[model samples]
Target chain A: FVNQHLCXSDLVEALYLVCGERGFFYTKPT
Target chain B: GIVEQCCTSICSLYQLENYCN
Candidate 1:
């Protein structure tokens, strides 16, 4: 994402903040 | 500190981000 670890966390956190409202947090595909 | 992501500095900063308590 950004630079691996920190970037990944930043992306995940950003995705969390922007996605949870749309119920996109737990829609993993099997 | 932005030329390349050295493992030691990366680990140190990463550790700070993780367990600096």
Candidate 2:
């Protein structure tokens, strides 16, 4: 549900929400 | 849980709304 590099404390939930809210087309990795 | 106001919790089926869930 998210980019692989993301390792935040709220990873899974945040990733779920992000993917739900923003779609798979999202911010490019920096 | 550090970034979440410095803390964290949860539930089942009831789908806990948690203090911040």
Candidate 3:
């Protein structure tokens, strides 16, 4: 699927990209 | 409050989408 190649990579890759691109969010309260 | 619920919903959605596919 050449079309698929345009996007490439799966959710894990996406998550990696998001986490890499976006700053981390701390859940625990101060 | 809402944050925990949102996180849970997100986790569930992520698991469903990622695993089912």
Candidate 4:
């Protein structure tokens, strides 16, 4: 389950960092 | 499925341990 404090942006960041290595579609944050 | 597994693990760790603010 996702934490209350963990928002969509956080998930995006997590996905970007974790999956981007494999060429996922999520964009990196500034 | 590896992507989902890894992302879930990362998010879980991030939430449980406060890895990020």
**Cα deviation of A3, candidate 2, in Å:** 17
**A1-30, model 1: which lDDT tens digit per residue?**
234432244433544454444433221334
What interface RMSD, in Å and to 1 decimal, does model 3 have? 12.4
List TM-score per model, in order: 0.27, 0.22, 0.22, 0.30
lDDT of 2 by residue, A1-30 (tens): 222333334443544454454433212344
Q: For residues B1-21, could you state the per-residue lDDT of candidate 3 as single tens digits? A: 212323343332233232221
Identify the superior model by lDDT, candidate 1 or candidate 3. Answer: 1
In candidate 4, what are the lDDT values of residues B1-21, reduced to their tens digit? 222333444435333223222
Off by over 4 Å in 1: A1-6, A21-30, B1-21
Clashing pairs in 2: none
What is the C-alpha lDDT profile of model 4 across A1-30, one tens digit per residue? 544332355655665564534544422343
Give the Å error, residue A6, model 4: 3.7
Candidate 3 per-residue lDDT, tens place, A1-30, comes to: 111211223333443444454543323456
DockQ value for model 4: 0.06
In terms of docking quality, how is candidate 2 classified?
incorrect
Best candidate (score: TM-score): 4
**List of clashing residue pairs for candidate 4:** none
Question: Residue A5: error of model 2 in Å?
Answer: 12
